[PDB]
Amino acid sequence: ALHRAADWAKSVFSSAALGDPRRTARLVNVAAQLAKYSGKSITISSEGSKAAQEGAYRFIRNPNVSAEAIRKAGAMQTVKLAQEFPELLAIEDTTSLSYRHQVAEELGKLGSIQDKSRGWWVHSVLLLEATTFRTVGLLHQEWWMRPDDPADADEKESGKWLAAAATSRLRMGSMMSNVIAVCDREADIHAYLQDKLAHNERFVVRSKHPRKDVESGLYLYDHLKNQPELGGYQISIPQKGVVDKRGKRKNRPARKASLSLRSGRITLKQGNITLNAVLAEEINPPKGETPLKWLLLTSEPVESLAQALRVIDIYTHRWRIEEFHKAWKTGAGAERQRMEEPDNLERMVSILSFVAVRLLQLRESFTPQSAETVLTPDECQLLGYLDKGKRKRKEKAGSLQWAYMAIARLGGFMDSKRTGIASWGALWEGWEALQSKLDGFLAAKDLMAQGIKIG
Amino acid sequence: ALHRAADWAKSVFSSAALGDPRRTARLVNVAAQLAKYSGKSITISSEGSKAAQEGAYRFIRNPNVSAEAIRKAGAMQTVKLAQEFPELLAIEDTTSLSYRHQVAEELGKLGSIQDKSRGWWVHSVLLLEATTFRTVGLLHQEWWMRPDDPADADEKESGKWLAAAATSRLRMGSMMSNVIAVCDREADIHAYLQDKLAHNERFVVRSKHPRKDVESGLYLYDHLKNQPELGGYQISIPQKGVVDKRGKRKNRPARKASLSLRSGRITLKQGNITLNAVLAEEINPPKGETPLKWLLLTSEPVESLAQALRVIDIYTHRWRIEEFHKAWKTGAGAERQRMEEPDNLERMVSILSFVAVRLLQLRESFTPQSAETVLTPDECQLLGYLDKGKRKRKEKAGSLQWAYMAIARLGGFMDSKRTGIASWGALWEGWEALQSKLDGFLAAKDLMAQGIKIG
DNA sequence: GACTTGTGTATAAGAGTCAG
DNA sequence: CTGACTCTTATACACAAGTC
DNA sequence: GACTTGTGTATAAGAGTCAG
DNA sequence: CTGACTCTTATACACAAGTC
Ligand SMILES: [Mg+2]
Ligand SMILES: [Mg+2]
Ligand SMILES: [Mn+2]
Ligand SMILES: [Mn+2]
């Protein structure tokens, strides 16, 4: 009702095994305040409390605080929630956290050896429920700093995927069985496939490298090309401006893409490992843009067309992780931090990752009931007042649908492409507004409740 | 009361000679909404009105709209206000407006010929009342695009200073007499001095180039060095982190600087032009940092120590223009714009310059009475509620002083250096907050005024 | 039980940014 | 160009709250 | 007076950003 | 890497409001 950020924070970080209750408690607080003011400074998040501000700073630079522990705590929570769903998607990818202030020096390599920007590489596992594909939470994160000299690396970077699974398993436990891992072409690694199968784990992986199907003695593509057409499907590709490494700008006009779909069993040369596969390829593609084509490898069934489309769907949700990445930087301000020591920075940013998720969830919580499912009478009331005269017939006077647009519109949303879809950032903006105005709504209340003249 | 941004905009742009009342009217509106949401997008400034949004866009890309005219309009206003003061300072400097999106191509050179960032050079005159040094307004702006090939320039860039004066004069008219021009070492131009004197205009200019004093046959410095010590003064130099062109970071610790002061009449070689001068030089400077030293040239009296300190003071206010520059970019979002054509962009940014000023004024309006001088009972009321328990004894319960900190604190302000001074951006943030919450304060009012249950 | 550790409150300053 | 701040880190006191 | 021009409302899309 | 949007610019209708 009155205290979400706070509730949220407790939910997520209540189990932090910090080595002192005080810590865990601070954590929740910090988390809370940060969340409340997603994207803003510790300072601003402190609402003027010096005590808070000092608490927060102290926390992140607290040498007894383990970021791992922090991350683990929030993850645990993910597991917990996961308990409620029968099929889960475990998205997995790597991103970077880049800094160029003094501390960057103490950080890892990201580009060239003389590159001023440095920091961490973080491989994450983001969980979704496979039914409506909503975001459940972070399940894992492996942060690391890349040595300037590759010979200085103890383990190949490529073992992350494997590192991830193991942690997943450990963490999910018996629930692993309901988890499907989704990864981009970079995970096209034999050892990887192999390891998953070994464990009887499920997955969807995009194919990067040509491989042979022992059975047919052909390359996956070629073999799949020969399979019968299960059907196909179509996608709307949206307009956009594009840029290249050289900075050449061009228009990528919208279009409708038609894809052929085929699937089959295959056996890879190496472990002589058998698995299913799917191939979606665009038909009569436009001479300009590049042909859409996905070849995926999975544990999942691919026989009929429904099955194979399920597969396509699953993978299509991989992008959610890219949204998470951006939600953590641009959104939560991961890269906007300027802590002066690697550990302080890491501790801070680790908390920000949970905020990133939340931001994502926020919209989901407004996506397809009556508004008061979600909102409170006063907010609901205010919202209504604020939205006075902007509602469209389409939106039931007072539904959850209404709510979302209303908040979106408070957010600045104007449906420029008329898709009716608002970015998570717009929604966050609207929510923020709503809660800000509410303050005054409730201020007044309190006054006139204690019998006081407004004017 | 209820509509400042709007009032403000009318004040400033009501005379725009746009060639159609509709235009001027749009202008005011646009201005208004932008101001209301200083720093934010047209879109967000549109509060959901499509009509507004479209009005705004249309305006800035309106080929019948003259930016000059826009700028002139707002300036006129400055003149008007200037009427109320006996001594004015006319700050003058050049800045750049830098873009790197497609349009940049159609823009001017700013750095190297292969530099992706391009745009305009803008030389401005910013007026202040010389009594409390508050900001009055923009008096002039000369925008221009620098050719890749210098031989392609019709007029030296250096004639700006002269271009400025002429426009000032024209504009100030008979009031020029009460105007003192303040400029950095770059205006150390003979023709410049000469032109001012020719007109009997007053000024304060920092000396860049060594020159001879005919009378003494010595260099200004040397001659001044020989003058008797009028006294001196001291300045508190604040701590700060510093960076160089190479990116080497260092700490510039705080310190108290002691300056010797001397003044005198001189006559420059060239027009055999006589004028006064002042020399402030730091005594027993710290081996590290560089010695503070200013040699200034003026029309003003410099004989006694009071007179010369007045001079120092005047020049010390030159920095206000640097604040204005930043208020226009970072603040108002000048460089955040992404109009796709030079004129659209210029029209937009021209309006933003007035917003920049306002931002500056905002704090001034809270600087050293009772709060309700400035605020309204409801805001005043809300503010109070919001500030409940943060006020310090120092601040009278309910004064203008109180108001400023209260708003500053809403702004995120925490007095990290305990100077008690809040940036203009913090204050803007607090004001924005206040007005945002007010909305809800007043929402509720309206409800319960029409007899309606809040909850 | 003996020995740290966090809080809230104060005071101070190094580090970083965007403006020169 | 004689800046003007915010964000980050730090320390002390008197007590509170934790750990081993 | 005859001939443009802005508004508000609709529909469409190119341009730009940060994430790959 | 099979994106997901926002900011900017554009056009039409039916009228309103301006200019020469
Ligand atoms: Mg360090
Ligand atoms: Mg162009
Ligand atoms: Mn300057
Ligand atoms: Mn990625």
Tab-separated table of N, CA and C in Angstrom, chain A residues 125-252:
chain	number	residue	atom	x	y	z
A	125	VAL	N	22.279	-14.690	-15.018
A	125	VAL	CA	21.178	-15.540	-15.350
A	125	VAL	C	19.931	-14.888	-14.847
A	126	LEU	N	19.032	-14.591	-15.754
A	126	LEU	CA	17.800	-13.939	-15.408
A	126	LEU	C	16.651	-14.893	-15.622
A	127	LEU	N	15.867	-15.112	-14.594
A	127	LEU	CA	14.751	-16.039	-14.666
A	127	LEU	C	13.408	-15.412	-15.001
A	128	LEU	N	12.656	-16.128	-15.864
A	128	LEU	CA	11.293	-15.750	-16.221
A	128	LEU	C	10.395	-16.964	-16.074
A	129	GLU	N	9.121	-16.697	-15.847
A	129	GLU	CA	8.169	-17.777	-15.778
A	129	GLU	C	7.819	-17.977	-17.259
A	130	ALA	N	7.813	-19.243	-17.706
A	130	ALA	CA	7.668	-19.573	-19.111
A	130	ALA	C	6.281	-19.590	-19.701
A	131	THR	N	5.373	-19.220	-18.849
A	131	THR	CA	3.977	-19.184	-19.153
A	131	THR	C	3.575	-17.824	-19.669
A	132	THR	N	3.801	-16.750	-18.903
A	132	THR	CA	3.477	-15.441	-19.462
A	132	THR	C	4.768	-14.657	-19.674
A	133	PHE	N	5.886	-15.367	-19.474
A	133	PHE	CA	7.169	-14.761	-19.664
A	133	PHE	C	7.414	-13.525	-18.800
A	134	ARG	N	6.899	-13.460	-17.600
A	134	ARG	CA	7.201	-12.316	-16.790
A	134	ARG	C	8.526	-12.591	-16.155
A	135	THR	N	9.167	-11.521	-15.735
A	135	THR	CA	10.450	-11.586	-15.088
A	135	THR	C	10.338	-11.998	-13.638
A	136	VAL	N	11.018	-13.100	-13.249
A	136	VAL	CA	10.996	-13.578	-11.851
A	136	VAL	C	12.118	-12.949	-11.024
A	137	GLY	N	13.303	-12.990	-11.618
A	137	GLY	CA	14.460	-12.418	-10.953
A	137	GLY	C	15.817	-12.944	-11.419
A	138	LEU	N	16.837	-12.383	-10.785
A	138	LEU	CA	18.213	-12.763	-11.028
A	138	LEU	C	18.443	-14.056	-10.289
A	139	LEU	N	19.117	-14.924	-10.979
A	139	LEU	CA	19.415	-16.172	-10.357
A	139	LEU	C	20.918	-16.262	-10.100
A	140	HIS	N	21.652	-15.615	-10.992
A	140	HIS	CA	23.064	-15.646	-10.805
A	140	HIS	C	23.754	-14.568	-11.578
A	141	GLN	N	24.923	-14.253	-11.003
A	141	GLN	CA	25.852	-13.327	-11.592
A	141	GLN	C	27.289	-13.707	-11.324
A	142	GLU	N	28.086	-13.720	-12.374
A	142	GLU	CA	29.471	-13.956	-12.158
A	142	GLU	C	30.159	-12.685	-12.638
A	143	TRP	N	30.810	-11.963	-11.719
A	143	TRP	CA	31.527	-10.756	-12.090
A	143	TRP	C	32.982	-11.079	-12.226
A	144	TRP	N	33.684	-10.419	-13.110
A	144	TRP	CA	35.090	-10.696	-13.164
A	144	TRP	C	35.859	-9.599	-13.849
A	145	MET	N	37.132	-9.549	-13.539
A	145	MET	CA	37.946	-8.575	-14.207
A	145	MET	C	38.947	-9.251	-15.160
A	146	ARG	N	38.921	-8.828	-16.424
A	146	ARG	CA	39.801	-9.386	-17.424
A	146	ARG	C	41.217	-8.773	-17.400
A	147	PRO	N	42.266	-9.639	-17.219
A	147	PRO	CA	43.665	-9.209	-17.155
A	147	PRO	C	44.075	-8.600	-18.453
A	148	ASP	N	45.004	-7.635	-18.402
A	148	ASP	CA	45.514	-7.039	-19.633
A	148	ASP	C	46.159	-8.144	-20.453
A	149	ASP	N	46.840	-9.079	-19.769
A	149	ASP	CA	47.473	-10.153	-20.474
A	149	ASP	C	46.736	-11.426	-20.303
A	150	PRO	N	46.198	-11.834	-21.455
A	150	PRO	CA	45.417	-13.045	-21.546
A	150	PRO	C	46.152	-14.237	-20.957
A	151	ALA	N	47.472	-14.284	-21.074
A	151	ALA	CA	48.134	-15.431	-20.497
A	151	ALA	C	47.996	-15.367	-18.979
A	152	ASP	N	47.484	-14.215	-18.497
A	152	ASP	CA	47.287	-14.005	-17.072
A	152	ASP	C	46.004	-14.472	-16.479
A	153	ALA	N	45.206	-15.069	-17.339
A	153	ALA	CA	43.930	-15.628	-16.992
A	153	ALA	C	44.083	-17.068	-16.599
A	154	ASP	N	43.465	-17.359	-15.468
A	154	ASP	CA	43.486	-18.699	-14.919
A	154	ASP	C	42.558	-19.647	-15.691
A	155	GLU	N	41.359	-19.148	-15.993
A	155	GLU	CA	40.339	-19.905	-16.696
A	155	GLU	C	39.830	-19.209	-17.941
A	156	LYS	N	39.567	-19.920	-19.038
A	156	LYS	CA	38.999	-19.273	-20.219
A	156	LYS	C	37.706	-18.566	-19.829
A	157	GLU	N	37.383	-17.492	-20.547
A	157	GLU	CA	36.166	-16.759	-20.257
A	157	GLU	C	34.955	-17.599	-20.560
A	158	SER	N	35.110	-18.386	-21.606
A	158	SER	CA	34.114	-19.314	-22.091
A	158	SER	C	33.564	-20.332	-21.061
A	159	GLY	N	34.233	-20.521	-19.921
A	159	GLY	CA	33.687	-21.430	-18.937
A	159	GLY	C	32.564	-20.775	-18.153
A	160	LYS	N	32.192	-19.579	-18.537
A	160	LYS	CA	31.153	-18.959	-17.758
A	160	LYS	C	29.866	-19.716	-17.918
A	161	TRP	N	29.593	-20.009	-19.157
A	161	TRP	CA	28.358	-20.689	-19.333
A	161	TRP	C	28.277	-21.892	-18.436
A	162	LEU	N	29.380	-22.577	-18.313
A	162	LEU	CA	29.334	-23.735	-17.450
A	162	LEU	C	29.280	-23.413	-15.966
A	163	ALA	N	29.953	-22.329	-15.634
A	163	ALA	CA	29.984	-21.865	-14.268
A	163	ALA	C	28.548	-21.528	-13.858
A	164	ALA	N	27.864	-20.892	-14.791
A	164	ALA	CA	26.487	-20.479	-14.578
A	164	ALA	C	25.534	-21.636	-14.211
A	165	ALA	N	25.588	-22.664	-15.035
A	165	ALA	CA	24.733	-23.818	-14.868
A	165	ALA	C	24.958	-24.459	-13.529
A	166	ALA	N	26.192	-24.573	-13.231
A	166	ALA	CA	26.402	-25.194	-11.985
A	166	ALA	C	25.799	-24.402	-10.874
A	167	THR	N	25.913	-23.103	-11.004
A	167	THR	CA	25.371	-22.354	-9.917
A	167	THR	C	23.874	-22.418	-9.961
A	168	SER	N	23.338	-22.476	-11.150
A	168	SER	CA	21.902	-22.530	-11.270
A	168	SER	C	21.314	-23.729	-10.562
A	169	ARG	N	21.869	-24.860	-10.961
A	169	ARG	CA	21.510	-26.145	-10.432
A	169	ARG	C	21.571	-26.107	-8.916
A	170	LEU	N	22.729	-25.683	-8.444
A	170	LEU	CA	22.887	-25.694	-7.021
A	170	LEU	C	21.731	-24.976	-6.402
A	171	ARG	N	21.499	-23.843	-7.007
A	171	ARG	CA	20.512	-22.970	-6.486
A	171	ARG	C	19.105	-23.423	-6.724
A	172	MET	N	18.807	-23.833	-7.945
A	172	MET	CA	17.440	-24.247	-8.180
A	172	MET	C	17.091	-25.551	-7.507
A	173	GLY	N	18.098	-26.405	-7.437
A	173	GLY	CA	17.934	-27.704	-6.832
A	173	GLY	C	17.068	-28.573	-7.742
A	174	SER	N	16.127	-29.294	-7.102
A	174	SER	CA	15.193	-30.170	-7.775
A	174	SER	C	14.355	-29.420	-8.829
A	175	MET	N	14.257	-28.112	-8.692
A	175	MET	CA	13.497	-27.332	-9.651
A	175	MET	C	14.156	-27.198	-11.022
A	176	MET	N	15.481	-27.478	-11.111
A	176	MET	CA	16.218	-27.370	-12.373
A	176	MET	C	15.444	-27.990	-13.541
A	177	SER	N	14.798	-29.095	-13.210
A	177	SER	CA	14.003	-29.834	-14.153
A	177	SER	C	12.995	-28.956	-14.850
A	178	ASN	N	12.555	-27.882	-14.236
A	178	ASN	CA	11.542	-27.078	-14.923
A	178	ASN	C	12.099	-25.856	-15.595
A	179	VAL	N	13.418	-25.862	-15.639
A	179	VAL	CA	14.157	-24.774	-16.203
A	179	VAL	C	14.794	-25.094	-17.534
A	180	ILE	N	14.527	-24.133	-18.431
A	180	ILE	CA	15.048	-24.061	-19.777
A	180	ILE	C	15.992	-22.868	-19.893
A	181	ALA	N	17.218	-23.157	-20.310
A	181	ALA	CA	18.226	-22.134	-20.437
A	181	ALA	C	18.250	-21.535	-21.816
A	182	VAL	N	18.271	-20.216	-21.898
A	182	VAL	CA	18.266	-19.624	-23.209
A	182	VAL	C	19.498	-18.781	-23.405
A	183	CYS	N	20.280	-19.072	-24.477
A	183	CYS	CA	21.520	-18.360	-24.775
A	183	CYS	C	21.812	-18.112	-26.262
A	184	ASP	N	22.471	-16.954	-26.536
A	184	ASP	CA	22.894	-16.478	-27.864
A	184	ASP	C	24.010	-17.372	-28.427
A	185	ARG	N	24.327	-17.201	-29.752
A	185	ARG	CA	25.336	-17.984	-30.510
A	185	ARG	C	26.666	-18.198	-29.827
A	186	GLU	N	26.981	-17.355	-28.862
A	186	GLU	CA	28.248	-17.463	-28.181
A	186	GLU	C	28.275	-18.639	-27.282
A	187	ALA	N	27.101	-19.129	-26.936
A	187	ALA	CA	27.173	-20.289	-26.104
A	187	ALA	C	27.222	-21.515	-26.978
A	188	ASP	N	27.283	-21.350	-28.315
A	188	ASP	CA	27.398	-22.495	-29.243
A	188	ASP	C	28.723	-23.229	-28.947
A	189	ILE	N	28.790	-23.911	-27.786
A	189	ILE	CA	29.987	-24.558	-27.338
A	189	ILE	C	29.651	-25.941	-26.970
A	190	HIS	N	30.391	-26.789	-27.622
A	190	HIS	CA	30.215	-28.198	-27.450
A	190	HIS	C	30.266	-28.610	-26.007
A	191	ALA	N	31.301	-28.163	-25.363
A	191	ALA	CA	31.390	-28.586	-24.014
A	191	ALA	C	30.125	-28.173	-23.323
A	192	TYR	N	29.616	-27.027	-23.756
A	192	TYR	CA	28.424	-26.531	-23.120
A	192	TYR	C	27.243	-27.455	-23.323
A	193	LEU	N	26.943	-27.688	-24.590
A	193	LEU	CA	25.848	-28.579	-24.906
A	193	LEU	C	26.016	-29.813	-24.053
A	194	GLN	N	27.093	-30.468	-24.345
A	194	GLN	CA	27.471	-31.634	-23.617
A	194	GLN	C	27.173	-31.569	-22.107
A	195	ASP	N	27.647	-30.546	-21.431
A	195	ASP	CA	27.401	-30.443	-20.004
A	195	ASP	C	25.935	-30.415	-19.600
A	196	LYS	N	25.130	-29.737	-20.414
A	196	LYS	CA	23.705	-29.617	-20.131
A	196	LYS	C	23.037	-30.952	-20.219
A	197	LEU	N	23.340	-31.618	-21.325
A	197	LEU	CA	22.807	-32.927	-21.616
A	197	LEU	C	23.253	-33.868	-20.513
A	198	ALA	N	24.545	-33.932	-20.290
A	198	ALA	CA	25.018	-34.740	-19.198
A	198	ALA	C	24.102	-34.652	-17.980
A	199	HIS	N	23.660	-33.444	-17.637
A	199	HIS	CA	22.830	-33.182	-16.471
A	199	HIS	C	21.332	-33.372	-16.662
A	200	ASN	N	20.982	-33.572	-17.937
A	200	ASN	CA	19.606	-33.700	-18.326
A	200	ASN	C	18.938	-32.369	-18.105
A	201	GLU	N	19.587	-31.310	-18.572
A	201	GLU	CA	19.015	-30.000	-18.402
A	201	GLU	C	18.506	-29.528	-19.719
A	202	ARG	N	17.527	-28.670	-19.663
A	202	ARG	CA	16.955	-28.242	-20.920
A	202	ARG	C	17.478	-26.886	-21.378
A	203	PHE	N	17.423	-26.645	-22.672
A	203	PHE	CA	17.951	-25.400	-23.141
A	203	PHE	C	17.559	-25.088	-24.556
A	204	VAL	N	17.830	-23.851	-24.903
A	204	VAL	CA	17.636	-23.330	-26.243
A	204	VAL	C	18.825	-22.460	-26.477
A	205	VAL	N	19.595	-22.866	-27.488
A	205	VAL	CA	20.834	-22.202	-27.860
A	205	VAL	C	20.935	-21.870	-29.343
A	206	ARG	N	21.304	-20.638	-29.648
A	206	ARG	CA	21.461	-20.336	-31.038
A	206	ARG	C	22.796	-20.864	-31.589
A	207	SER	N	22.731	-21.321	-32.823
A	207	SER	CA	23.880	-21.897	-33.465
A	207	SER	C	24.685	-20.831	-34.154
A	208	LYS	N	25.985	-20.834	-33.891
A	208	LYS	CA	26.895	-19.877	-34.487
A	208	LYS	C	27.796	-20.527	-35.553
A	209	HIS	N	28.442	-21.636	-35.150
A	209	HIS	CA	29.368	-22.475	-35.906
A	209	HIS	C	28.732	-23.638	-36.648
A	210	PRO	N	29.123	-23.811	-37.905
A	210	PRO	CA	28.654	-24.917	-38.687
A	210	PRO	C	29.186	-26.193	-38.060
A	211	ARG	N	28.288	-27.166	-38.037
A	211	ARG	CA	28.585	-28.433	-37.445
A	211	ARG	C	27.970	-29.502	-38.270
A	212	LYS	N	28.480	-30.676	-38.066
A	212	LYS	CA	27.913	-31.755	-38.812
A	212	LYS	C	26.985	-32.582	-37.945
A	213	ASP	N	25.967	-33.015	-38.683
A	213	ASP	CA	24.992	-33.928	-38.210
A	213	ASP	C	25.546	-35.287	-38.668
A	214	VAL	N	25.980	-36.094	-37.721
A	214	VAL	CA	26.514	-37.361	-38.087
A	214	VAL	C	25.562	-38.192	-38.928
A	215	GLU	N	24.337	-38.315	-38.442
A	215	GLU	CA	23.341	-39.119	-39.129
A	215	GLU	C	23.275	-38.853	-40.628
A	216	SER	N	23.253	-37.593	-40.992
A	216	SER	CA	23.111	-37.221	-42.387
A	216	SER	C	24.423	-36.956	-43.072
A	217	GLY	N	25.424	-36.817	-42.215
A	217	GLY	CA	26.760	-36.516	-42.653
A	217	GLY	C	26.824	-35.140	-43.237
A	218	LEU	N	25.717	-34.398	-43.046
A	218	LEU	CA	25.574	-33.014	-43.510
A	218	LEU	C	25.700	-31.990	-42.395
A	219	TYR	N	25.877	-30.745	-42.835
A	219	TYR	CA	25.922	-29.599	-41.941
A	219	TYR	C	24.496	-29.328	-41.462
A	220	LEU	N	24.327	-28.934	-40.203
A	220	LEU	CA	22.997	-28.701	-39.649
A	220	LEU	C	22.119	-27.938	-40.605
A	221	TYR	N	22.657	-26.871	-41.098
A	221	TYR	CA	21.790	-26.143	-41.970
A	221	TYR	C	21.181	-26.941	-43.121
A	222	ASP	N	22.112	-27.598	-43.809
A	222	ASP	CA	21.784	-28.319	-45.027
A	222	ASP	C	20.791	-29.394	-44.851
A	223	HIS	N	20.954	-30.017	-43.703
A	223	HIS	CA	20.102	-31.093	-43.297
A	223	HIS	C	18.736	-30.539	-42.971
A	224	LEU	N	18.747	-29.439	-42.241
A	224	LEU	CA	17.477	-28.891	-41.878
A	224	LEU	C	16.788	-28.348	-43.087
A	225	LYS	N	17.558	-27.841	-44.009
A	225	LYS	CA	16.948	-27.279	-45.178
A	225	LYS	C	16.084	-28.272	-45.929
A	226	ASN	N	16.445	-29.532	-45.767
A	226	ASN	CA	15.777	-30.663	-46.406
A	226	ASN	C	14.559	-31.218	-45.703
A	227	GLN	N	14.419	-30.803	-44.482
A	227	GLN	CA	13.304	-31.262	-43.754
A	227	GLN	C	12.116	-30.549	-44.364
A	228	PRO	N	10.965	-31.173	-44.182
A	228	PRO	CA	9.726	-30.609	-44.629
A	228	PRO	C	9.409	-29.369	-43.822
A	229	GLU	N	8.677	-28.470	-44.493
A	229	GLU	CA	8.173	-27.204	-43.960
A	229	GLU	C	7.071	-27.470	-42.951
A	230	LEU	N	7.295	-27.161	-41.688
A	230	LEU	CA	6.267	-27.403	-40.677
A	230	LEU	C	5.153	-26.411	-40.796
A	231	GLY	N	5.535	-25.288	-41.364
A	231	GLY	CA	4.727	-24.117	-41.588
A	231	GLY	C	5.726	-22.984	-41.568
A	232	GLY	N	5.333	-21.859	-41.037
A	232	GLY	CA	6.245	-20.754	-40.941
A	232	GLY	C	5.582	-19.844	-39.950
A	233	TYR	N	5.919	-18.560	-39.999
A	233	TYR	CA	5.319	-17.538	-39.153
A	233	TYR	C	5.851	-16.253	-39.677
A	234	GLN	N	5.278	-15.165	-39.188
A	234	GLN	CA	5.701	-13.841	-39.634
A	234	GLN	C	5.989	-12.870	-38.506
A	235	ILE	N	6.922	-11.981	-38.761
A	235	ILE	CA	7.217	-11.008	-37.744
A	235	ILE	C	7.160	-9.577	-38.257
A	236	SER	N	6.699	-8.680	-37.405
A	236	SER	CA	6.722	-7.319	-37.877
A	236	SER	C	8.047	-6.693	-37.473
A	237	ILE	N	8.852	-6.331	-38.449
A	237	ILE	CA	10.086	-5.642	-38.165
A	237	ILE	C	9.825	-4.139	-38.213
A	238	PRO	N	10.119	-3.485	-37.120
A	238	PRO	CA	9.846	-2.074	-37.003
A	238	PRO	C	10.892	-1.139	-37.600
A	239	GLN	N	10.456	0.075	-37.958
A	239	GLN	CA	11.360	1.092	-38.492
A	239	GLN	C	12.373	1.505	-37.436
A	240	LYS	N	13.514	1.966	-37.917
A	240	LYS	CA	14.521	2.476	-37.028
A	240	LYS	C	15.633	3.078	-37.838
A	241	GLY	N	16.365	4.005	-37.209
A	241	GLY	CA	17.555	4.598	-37.780
A	241	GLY	C	18.676	3.616	-37.354
A	242	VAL	N	19.704	3.432	-38.177
A	242	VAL	CA	20.762	2.529	-37.782
A	242	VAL	C	22.100	3.171	-37.967
A	243	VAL	N	23.069	2.638	-37.233
A	243	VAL	CA	24.441	3.125	-37.305
A	243	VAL	C	25.429	1.983	-37.321
A	244	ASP	N	26.587	2.233	-37.960
A	244	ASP	CA	27.665	1.248	-38.051
A	244	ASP	C	28.904	1.699	-37.306
A	245	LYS	N	29.844	0.758	-37.115
A	245	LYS	CA	31.126	0.967	-36.429
A	245	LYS	C	31.903	2.203	-36.905
A	246	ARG	N	31.660	2.555	-38.170
A	246	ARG	CA	32.240	3.690	-38.886
A	246	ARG	C	31.426	4.966	-38.702
A	247	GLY	N	30.182	4.775	-38.216
A	247	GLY	CA	29.220	5.834	-37.913
A	247	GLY	C	28.301	6.256	-39.053
A	248	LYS	N	28.218	5.371	-40.034
A	248	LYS	CA	27.372	5.667	-41.145
A	248	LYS	C	25.942	5.344	-40.786
A	249	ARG	N	25.172	6.392	-40.911
A	249	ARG	CA	23.768	6.305	-40.639
A	249	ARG	C	22.971	5.991	-41.883
A	250	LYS	N	21.955	5.157	-41.631
A	250	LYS	CA	20.955	4.693	-42.580
A	250	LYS	C	19.585	4.394	-41.929
A	251	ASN	N	18.501	4.452	-42.751
A	251	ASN	CA	17.123	4.163	-42.342
A	251	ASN	C	16.775	2.679	-42.506
A	252	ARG	N	16.279	2.061	-41.447
A	252	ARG	CA	15.872	0.706	-41.597
A	252	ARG	C	14.372	0.768	-41.486
